[PDB]
Design a protein around this ligand. Structure first.
Ligand SMILES: CCCCCCCCCCCCCCCCCC(=O)OC[C@H](CO[C@@H]1O[C@H](CO[C@H]2O[C@H](CO)[C@H](O)[C@H](O)[C@H]2O)[C@H](O)[C@H](O)[C@H]1O)OC(=O)CCCCCCCCCCCCCCCCC
Ligand SMILES: CCCCCCCCCCCCCCCCCC(=O)OC[C@H](CO[C@@H]1O[C@H](CO[C@H]2O[C@H](CO)[C@H](O)[C@H](O)[C@H]2O)[C@H](O)[C@H](O)[C@H]1O)OC(=O)CCCCCCCCCCCCCCCCC
Ligand code: CLA
Ligand code: CLA
Ligand code: CLA
Ligand code: CLA
Ligand code: CLA
Ligand code: CLA
Ligand SMILES: CC1=C(/C=C/C(C)=C/C=C/C(C)=C/C=C/C=C(C)/C=C/C=C(C)/C=C/C2=C(C)CCCC2(C)C)C(C)(C)CCC1
Ligand SMILES: CC1=C(/C=C/C(C)=C/C=C/C(C)=C/C=C/C=C(C)/C=C/C=C(C)/C=C/C2=C(C)CCCC2(C)C)C(C)(C)CCC1
Ligand SMILES: CCCCCCCCCCCCO[C@H]1O[C@H](CO)[C@@H](O[C@H]2O[C@H](CO)[C@@H](O)[C@H](O)[C@H]2O)[C@H](O)[C@H]1O
Ligand SMILES: [Fe+2]
Lengths: 36, 44, 329, 31, 37, 32, 416, 53, 66, 327, 34
């Protein structure tokens, strides 16, 4: 039961961290009207 | 593992070090005067 | 010199060449919506009955326990839980988790996160394709309605048990109980929502009939007219002036939308604003700000009450209300 | 066997949806 | 229950809440007077 | 003076509307 | 129309015009203060001394009596003169703000960039924008300390949890330990925990305001003296619409939080001027009925919670986490103690619950505040979506539509 | 009480129109008319070229 | 010019005619709408409902009299 | 042209402030009388002698509660003509027995016939296909089935909807309580069409306005197809199929729900699942949301029947009134 | 001739002489005039 909590916590934090660090990876530049 | 901050710290470290490796070759030190930064270094 | 793993990951995530766009919002959307879908399918097919009331009489909602597709539902969480966070690891057994309506909480929370991330993903793809970003604002209205029906009404009522069940007959039961307790039919915001939905259907059928009526001839005698349009063509596929003349002569000439842009803004705006207002009505009735009460509004000279149609509606509400309060006293 | 029929119908609908998404007619832009 | 030396200012008090609303209608009539410029 | 189709149509609406509007106003002063 | 915006989007013409933008903002602030003063005067003009504040549709006066102005023991309203002086002070301050706003909008400088370089700004000047944010953060941190002055030195705050029925209590020992404060901030938002809404004492409130004021003043100093870092510069959009969108998202979060706050919390919104909460009214009905049952000659009214708790049964068992100042003297370690119920019951505790049960066409001011600020919070989230999308698309350069010559989709590979 | 006639109504009410649609599409593929991304008919009975061609 | 002078007389006359159609009680008699003092009578304490189709005219007259 | 018929035809189709046509000879008087009859009823005419209700502005009702109520149940399916054997020329007795309802319904029914003929006439005059007339057949089918076919299968005109806001609200709860109309699959197809039509209106208006060209076609169909293919999985590629679909789904929703109302006229309702009802009878612990709904339908029926049908003189004691306290 | 039958005959006659014939005459007049 605690192991399931561990795995769910790890998965949730992994996906949230993917979202957060992805939007920090110069997201406004990833657009087709980029200057250079 | 009484507190559950080890999962938070550990996973955000692993993805954070991957993001830090990408950030290392970003030549973002110079400041820009624009609405958004168009500079993004690709292929290392 | 070698590109970092994070750069390749960011290039693949925000790639516009994927069959389904993923994006950073999709990094939240896809796992949450997939676990909500899997949990909903499993709980709909096989799940033991949930004691929603608390008086140890459970409600069967799964197909394996004597339900069909119409009557089957994922029953809301138990009244004992209320608005408590109830994951699987907080229950003593899986049997107790299924008995208290935990799958409802799991599916509802993952679905809510998924639809908010769907709004963000719609903005994200609109940004990667270089188009204007207001489709997500249009999708914010059914998301607001789902939020009011699944999260915000349980917050106001203090329990996830009176949230809308994830089923057809459960949806009808929610509607009847909500009408009994709040008189949503006489709420002005539900009137605005019905106006938005009815008008949206009217304007959709009207615009579709107007465009279908004035299609320019490009096909043969009995060939399907849809081959007359080429995907990616520049010229108009229908005669705009003929449709405008028909609509002007149909009611009056000043009401014809001479601009297709203003007409399409009106089409996109009317049901969205209507659904926004009905969502805000449902969420405001959660905090007991009920609809219009026109009960006993007509009396004679001697004080006797002359009923109106609102009194008959109130009688129906009273019948549903006294049947809802199962052994409350 | 009613629940079996219901499950078969729902799974078949999801299979049809999967085929309609991923094995759709590929859109080609006219020249 | 207004204070005693200002009880004669009771009628003007009830219309004080509605002044912010008519400021919004003031913007609409100003544009309508200028011809929606 | 003017008795054309334009005159007959809009007087068929305006004449009962104003009469009904006066009747509605009178109902506001009925003590009930 | 030559600016690109029609009359229905006319305030969008003031994005680059800094002086007129300042005039519009100061005029709107004057309107806010004018409404504040006018509502305070309206509420004191219609105030009936015998009735409680929540029976007269009062929203502004209940906030003022929570700060210890014109209050008595048990929540009695004594003198409406402090409320009157607060309303007239806001009314006088509104005329100053209205005149300054109309001056800066009409006859002031159009763009205060060529003159007054301290007040002139550009939306892309990341150093200048952090300075304004730092100054206003310092001002907000000072304002948070004004509540601390009102709580520890000037008069006191009405402590509804004081024994005997509540009183204006001076706080001398605020909770300065950051573990409790930031555990309140990091608390779960579900039932039982309740995030920051479960602040159940004045000490945690004033200590959290001390910590917030210190954080805001050091953050304001920091934002004045520093510049955005490289990650922040590469992440955000530097334009007026973008900053408006960020503020809209924040304000939407605050609106929803305050709606649920006034719906649930009993400390910052005591049940003597705002009325009982929904759970409070339900448990008041159950408790009063149990009192009548015990007086006129108990498992019929109570039940055994599985967590070792004694709580009221029936439909009100879902509100077992409700904490009230008139239940706690009868609540021991395991919940409702039967001996404490039969013996320690006091006449002040039974009148409150007798009043709350019949005040569950009446709409409570809690319901009005909750519904109105929830409506505003949701629509401000919608406005955040609109302005964030428009700011990002206008910064990238395709907010006016797709270029027919270089269409981005036509240059991509086919999907399948 | 498994209603025997109801089982046939669900089965045959699903099988027969699915069969009719599947048979129509397969002979459409054989004739080269099973796509909407093609030009209108050049001649009676002659389908137009595909957009990719 | 004559547009306004007609509508300065006929329009107030029509509004007045509507006002004195309800305030004089003529609207109650014309449409059969009961006044607030005649919803019930002394000899009739229940709701007066028509129970026969072809005697509906006669039934209403012997029930609304007085 | 040549012949008196041709001058009338030319005058009726002449471009004026409002088109008349030959259909206007039927549409304009019938629609004016139906709307004028409805406005007369909600202002002056009562429902005291038919329903035991006040339903006019004269009696103190507002716009939400005023209605033109249905005739008395004793009238049956009578046409209730002003000169008919019920009113016998008495305009006052005609108003009291509910003759204004049949006036509004019959003139309204010929009004919507004239409007659909008007759609056919202007389409022939302009020269376009008559798809707006086919789309209006949806509202025609809904009006005909609900206001005419449903009372014609029932006992009388009394059980038809009354022309009012709160009166329509009663009709919604009446058909739920007495017919379990929400559980009917034809209403379900109607809800899908009407909610789908509102979805199609919102999603098409947003897509066109958000794929516009900065200024032939005003928006990018290729960009719109690419966006929805990656967001939703499928997307429209044919503009003509997209607009037929915007016609089809709300109109098909009107037509599918009208077929179920015809069944409801003869009480051929989808009230119960028999196997689920039998299993709950033998096993009292069995309970689903469908079984809870049938309990609420019993609560609707018994608690409204005393006042919704006052002609029956229902006297229900408190013992027989269903309650949650007796399960 | 019962009163209902006489009422029906009167209704038919009234419809023809108040609705049909006046509208037709007005249409003929305005069509020959314009
Ligand atoms: C943040 C994440 C938001 C998701 C949370 C959803 C569920 C929140 C909840 O169950 O809500 C309830 C809680 C309030 O908590 C309540 O807090 C109460 C605190 O009161 C206690 O403390 C008080 C102190 O005086 C009183 O004494 C009271 O008697 C005593 O019980 C109790 O603990 C209750 O059990 C507990 O439910 O809200 C919260 O914590 C904060 C709510 C955040 C604002 C609402 C979120 C916005 C709505 C969801 C988003 C939809 C957006 C729509 C856009 C589309
Ligand atoms: C689409 C575009 C068209 C749009 C509509 C355009 C406007 C058309 C307007 C026409 C509407 C006609 C309504 C006529 C009223 C009606 O019908 O009135 C009904 C009468 C029958 O009268 C009823 O008859 C019933 C049966 O009685 C019989 O049985 C009783 C036994 O108890 C007694 O013996 C009684 O004396 C004896 O007559 C009861 O008496 C009722 O009280 C009495 O109202 O028929 C009659 O007028 C004639 C019936 C002949 C059939 C005519 C078909 C039209 C109706 C089709 C719908 C009926 C289908 C029902 C299913 C749904
Ligand atoms: C602090 C909040 C704030 C600020 C400073 C702005 C600022 C701006 N907005 Mg943004 N917005 C906000 C909140 C805000 N908005 C919210 C909450 C929403 C969601 C509804 C939006 C959605 C929005 C849209 C869709 C648009 C803007 C636009 C604009 C710009 C033009 C202003 C304008 O059009 O006024 C004009 C004001 C009016 C015409 C009057 C509006 C009154 C409406 C019709 C009724 C509102 C209800 C009101 C309370 C009355 C109710 C009465 C009731 C009793 C019946 C300007 C930059 C425009 C923009 O995008 O271009 C740059 C534009 O098109 N906003
Ligand atoms: C909170 C409300 C508010 C405020 C403060 C502003 C502010 C402003 N607007 Mg906006 N606007 C609003 C709401 C507001 N707007 C709404 C709801 C709409 C939709 C109708 C608009 C549509 C709009 C358009 C289309 C334009 C503006 C423009 C402007 C600016 C120039 C004003 C001007 O030239 O007026 C002149 C007005 C008058 C001469 C008549 C009013 C006279 C004064 C101001 C009345 C003050 C009364 C008050 C009691 C005085 C107290 C003083 C006393 C205390 C001493 C100004 C900064 C313009 C612009 O953006 O830049 C130039 C412009 O073109 N607005
Ligand atoms: C969100 C802020 C807020 C809240 C929670 C309240 C709450 C309340 N006010 Mg107040 N008020 C406000 C802002 C607010 N007001 C504003 C901006 C004005 C200026 C118009 C007023 C002017 C005002 C007056 C003059 C009075 C109140 C009164 C009231 C009470 C009864 C409200 C009522 O009758 O419903 C009416 C509901 C509506 C009008 C809903 C329509 C809202 C638009 C919906 C569509 C958008 C209630 C406690 C009354 C009283 O009891 O207190 C002294 C009273 O006399 N209000
Ligand atoms: C947010 C508040 C705010 C801000 C930032 C400004 C900004 C400014 N004001 Mg306005 N103004 C305001 C509110 C504000 N005003 C209010 C509340 C009033 C009513 C009293 C006025 C009435 C007003 C007048 C009458 C004048 C200004 C002037 C000025 C300028 C010089 C101020 C100075 O030197 O301070 C220095 C402080 C620290 C270095 C500056 C651009 C002057 C002006 O606009 O140009 C000549 C001036 O004559 N203001
Ligand atoms: C009103 C609240 C507010 C706002 C709008 C900002 C604004 C900003 N802050 Mg500041 N901050 C605040 C309060 C605020 N700060 C307070 C109270 C403190 C003291 C704890 C700080 C301490 C702080 C640090 C340590 C940093 C920011 C950073 C930032 C930037 C990015 C923030 C983010 O992405 O998450 C942004 C310019 C980051 C930035 O790079 O510097 C500007 C960053 O590293 N802030
Ligand atoms: C129609 C517009 C409108 C109106 C009339 C109101 C009205 C109200 N709101 Mg709402 N608001 C709105 C729009 C509105 N709001 C919108 C669109 C949002 C975003 C969605 C909000 C977000 C919001 C929040 C988050 C909250 C309110 C709250 C309130 C109430 C108190 C406001 C207050 O105290 O501010 C005060 C603001 C100041 C700047 C004053 C600061 C003074 C600090 C010092 C105070 C004095 C000190 C104690 C003593 C000093 C002297 C001493 C030392 C001697 C009031 C009824 C509060 C409420 O009670 O709950 C709902 C609340 O928490 N509002
Ligand atoms: C710019 C502009 C605008 C805006 C404006 C504004 C917004 C304004 C504001 C203003 C303001 C906001 C003002 C205020 C005022 C106030 C006043 C003027 C005051 C006075 C006071 C007094 C007089 C008082 C007295 C008293 C006392 C003392 C006691 C009690 C009684 C009494 C109350 C009487 C608009 C939109 C319109 C338009 C465009 C332009
Ligand atoms: C007063 C008081 C209190 C409090 C205190 C405190 C101390 C507070 C604080 C608070 C806090 C401390 C807060 C915080 C917040 C935060 C937030 C809200 C965040 C957000 C974030 C964001 C917004 C971001 C985003 C993003 C991402 C994620 C990615 C990338 C992109 C971006 C950047 C956009 C208490 C309750 C105790 C008591 C009573 C009184
Ligand atoms: C800022 C937006 C906030 C949105 C919150 C929701 C607001 C929309 C709700 C509209 C109906 C609210 O209705 C609530 O207030 C009305 C105030 O007159 C009252 O409703 C009643 O008002 C009058 C008597 O007081 C009478 O006309 C009626 O009996 C009834 O309309 C009731 O107190 C309650 O039914
Ligand atoms: Fe279109």
């Amino acid at each position: 039961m605690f192991t399931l909590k561990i795995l769910v916590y790890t998965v949730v934090i992994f996906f949230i961290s993917l979202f957060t660090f992805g939007f920090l990876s110069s997201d406004p530049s990833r657009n087709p009207n980029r200057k250079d | 593992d009484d507190s559950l901050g080890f999962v938070l710290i550990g996973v955000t470290a692993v993805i954070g070090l991957a993001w830090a490796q990408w950030q290392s070759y970003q030549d973002d030190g110079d400041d820009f005067f624009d609405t958004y930064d168009s500079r993004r270094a690709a292929a290392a | 010199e070698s590109a970092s793993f994070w750069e390749q990951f960011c290039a693949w995530i925000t790639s516009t060449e994927n069959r389904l766009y993923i994006g950073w919002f999709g990094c939240l959307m896809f796992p949450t919506l997939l676990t909500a879908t899997s949990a909903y399918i499993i709980a709909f097919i096989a799940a033991p009955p949930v004691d929603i009331d608390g008086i140890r009489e459970p409600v069967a909602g799964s197909l394996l326990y004597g339900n069909n597709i119409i009557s089957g539902a994922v029953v809301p969480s138990s009244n004992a839980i209320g608005v408590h966070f109830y994951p699987i690891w907080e229950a003593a057994s899986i049997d107790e988790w299924l008995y208290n309506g935990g799958p409802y909480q799991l599916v509802v929370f993952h679905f809510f996160i998924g639809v908010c991330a769907y709004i963000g993903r719609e903005w994200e793809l609109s940004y990667r394709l270089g188009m204007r970003p207001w489709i997500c604002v249009a999708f914010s209205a059914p998301v607001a309605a789902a939020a009011a029906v699944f999260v915000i009404y349980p917050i106001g009522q203090g329990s996830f048990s009176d949230g809308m069940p994830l089923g057809i007959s459960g949806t009808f039961n929610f509607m009847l109980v909500f009408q009994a307790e709040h008189n949503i039919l006489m709420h002005p915001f539900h009137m605005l929502g019905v106006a938005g939905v009815f008008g949206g259907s009217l304007f959709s059928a009207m615009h579709g009939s107007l465009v279908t009526s004035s299609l320019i001839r490009e096909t043969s005698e009995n060939e399907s007219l849809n081959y007359g349009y080429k995907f990616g063509q520049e010229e108009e596929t229908y005669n705009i002036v003929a449709a405008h003349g028909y609509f002007g002569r149909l009611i009056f000439q000043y009401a014809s939308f001479n601009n297709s842009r203003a007409l399409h803004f009106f089409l996109g705006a009317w049901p969205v604003v209507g659904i926004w207002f009905t969502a805000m009505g449902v969420a405001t009735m959660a905090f007991n700000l009920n609809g219009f009460n026109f009960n006993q509004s007509v009396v004679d000279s001697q004080g006797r009450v002359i009923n109106t149609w609102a009194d008959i509606l109130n009688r129906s509400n009273l019948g549903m209300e006294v049947m809802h309060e199962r052994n409350a006293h | 066997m009613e629940a079996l029929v219901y499950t078969f119908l729902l799974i078949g609908t999801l299979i049809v949806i999967f085929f309609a998404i991923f094995f759709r007619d590929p859109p080609r832009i006219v020249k | 229950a207004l204070p005693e030396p200002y009880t004669a200012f009771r009628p003007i008090v009830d219309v004080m809440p509605a002044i912010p609303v008519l400021f919004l209608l003031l913007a609409f009539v100003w544009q309508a007077s200028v011809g929606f410029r | 003076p003017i008795f054309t189709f334009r005159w007959l149509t809009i007087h068929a609406l305006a004449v009962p509307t104003v009469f009904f509007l006066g009747a509605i106003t009178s109902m506001q002063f009925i003590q009930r | 129309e030559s600016t690109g915006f029609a009359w229905w989007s006319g305030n969008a013409r003031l994005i680059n015009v800094s002086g007129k933008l300042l005039g519009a903002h100061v005029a709107h602030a004057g309107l806010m203060v004018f409404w504040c003063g006018a509502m305070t005067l309206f509420e004191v003009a219609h105030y009936i001394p015998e009735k409680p504040l929540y029976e007269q549709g009062c929203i502004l006066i209940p906030h003022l009596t929570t700060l210890g102005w014109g209050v008595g023991p048990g929540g009695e309203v004594t003198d409406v003169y402090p409320f009157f002086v607060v309303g007239v002070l806001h009314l006088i301050s509104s005329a100053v703000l209205g005149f300054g706003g109309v001056y800066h909008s009409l006859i002031g400088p159009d763009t205060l960039e060529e003159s007054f370089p301290f007040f002139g700004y550009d939306w892309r000047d990341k150093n200048k924008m952090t300075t304004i944010l730092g100054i206003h953060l310092i001002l907000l941190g000072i304002g948070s300390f004004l509540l601390v002055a009102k709580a520890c030195f000037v008069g006191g705050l009405y402590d509804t949890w004081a024994p005997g029925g509540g009183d204006v209590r001076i706080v001398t020992a605020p909770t300065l330990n950051p573990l409790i404060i930031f555990g309140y901030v990091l608390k779960s938002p579900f039932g039982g925990d309740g995030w920051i809404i479960s602040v159940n004492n004045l000490e945690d409130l004033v200590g959290g305001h001390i910590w917030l004021g210190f954080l805001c003043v050091v953050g304001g100093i920091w934002h004045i003296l520093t510049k955005p870092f490289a990650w922040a510069r590469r992440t955000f959009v530097w334009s007026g619409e973008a900053y408006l969108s960020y503020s809209l998202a924040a304000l939407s979060v605050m609106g929803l939080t305050a709606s649920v706050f006034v719906w649930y919390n009993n400390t910052a919104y005591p049940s003597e001027f705002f009325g009982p909460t929904g759970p409070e009214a339900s448990q008041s009905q159950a408790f009063t009925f149990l009192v009548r049952d015990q007086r006129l000659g108990l498992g019929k009214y109570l039940m055994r919670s599985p967590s070792g708790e004694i709580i009221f049964g029936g439909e009100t068992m879902r509100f077992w986490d409700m904490r009230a100042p008139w239940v706690e003297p009868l609540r021991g370690p395991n919940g409702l103690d039967l001996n404490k119920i039969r013996n320690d019951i006091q006449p002040w505790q039974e009148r409150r619950a007798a009043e709350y049960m019949t005040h569950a066409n009446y709409v409570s001011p809690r319901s009005w505040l909750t519904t109105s600020h929830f409506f505003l919070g949701f629509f401000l989230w919608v406005g955040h979506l609109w302005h964030a999308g428009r700011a990002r698309a206008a910064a990238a350069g395709f907010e006016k539509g797709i270029n027919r010559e270089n269409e981005p989709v036509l240059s991509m590979r086919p999907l399948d | 009480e498994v209603s025997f006639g109801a089982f046939l109504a669900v089965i045959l009410g699903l099988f027969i129109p699915v069969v009719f649609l599947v048979t129509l599409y397969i002979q459409s593929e054989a004739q080269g008319t099973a796509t909407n991304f093609r030009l209108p008919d050049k001649a009676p009975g002659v389908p137009g070229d595909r957009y990719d061609a | 010019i004559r547009y306004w002078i007609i509508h300065s007389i006929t329009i107030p006359s029509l509004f007045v005619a509507g006002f004195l159609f309800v305030s004089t009680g003529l609207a109650y008699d014309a449409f059969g709408t009961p006044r607030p003092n005649e919803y019930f009578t002394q000899d009739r304490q229940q709701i007066p409902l028509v129970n026969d189709r072809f005697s509906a005219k006669q039934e209403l007259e012997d029930l609304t009299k007085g | 042209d040549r012949g008196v018929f041709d001058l009338i035809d030319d005058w009726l189709k002449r471009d004026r402030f409002v088109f008349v046509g030959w259909s206007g000879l039927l549409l304009f008087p019938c629609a004016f009388l139906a709307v004028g009859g409805w406005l007369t009823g909600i202002t002056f005419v009562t429902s005291w002698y038919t329903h035991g209700l006040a339903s006019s502005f004269l009696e103190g009702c507002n716009f939400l509660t005023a209605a033109v109520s249905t005739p008395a149940n004793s009238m049956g399916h009578s046409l209730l003509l002003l000169w008919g054997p019920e009113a016998q020329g008495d305009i006052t007795r005609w108003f009291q027995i509910g003759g204004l309802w049949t006036f509004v319904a019959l003139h309204g029914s010929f009004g919507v016939i004239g409007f659909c003929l008007r759609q056919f006439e202007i389409a022939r005059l302009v020269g376009i296909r008559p798809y707006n007339a086919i789309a209006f057949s949806g509202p025609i089918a809904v009006f005909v089935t609900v206001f005419l076919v449903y009372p014609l299968g029932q006992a009388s005109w009394f059980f038809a909807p009354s022309f009012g806001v709160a009166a329509i609200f009663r009709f919604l709860l009446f058909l739920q309580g007495f017919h379990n109309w929400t559980l009917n699959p034809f209403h379900m197809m109607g809800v899908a069409g009407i909610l789908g039509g509102a979805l199609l209106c919102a999603i098409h208006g947003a897509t066109v306005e958000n794929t516009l060209f900065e200024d032939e076609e005003t928006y990018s169909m290729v960009t719109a197809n690419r966006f929805w293919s990656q967001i939703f999985g499928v997307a429209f590629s044919n503009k003509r199929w997209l607009h037929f679909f915007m016609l089809f789904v709300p109109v098909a929703g009107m037509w599918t729900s009208s077929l179920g109302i015809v069944g409801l006229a003869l009480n051929l309702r989808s009230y119960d699942f028999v196997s689920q009802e039998l299993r709950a009878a033998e096993d009292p612990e069995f309970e689903t949301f469908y079984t809870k709904n049938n309990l609420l339908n019993e609560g609707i029926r018994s608690w409204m029947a005393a006042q919704d049908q006052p002609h029956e003189n229902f006297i229900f004691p408190e013992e027989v009134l269903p309650r949650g306290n007796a399960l | 001739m019962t009163p209902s039958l006489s009422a029906f005959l009167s209704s038919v006659i009234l419809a023809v002489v108040i609705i049909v014939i006046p509208i037709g005459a007005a249409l003929v007049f305005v069509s020959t005039s314009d």
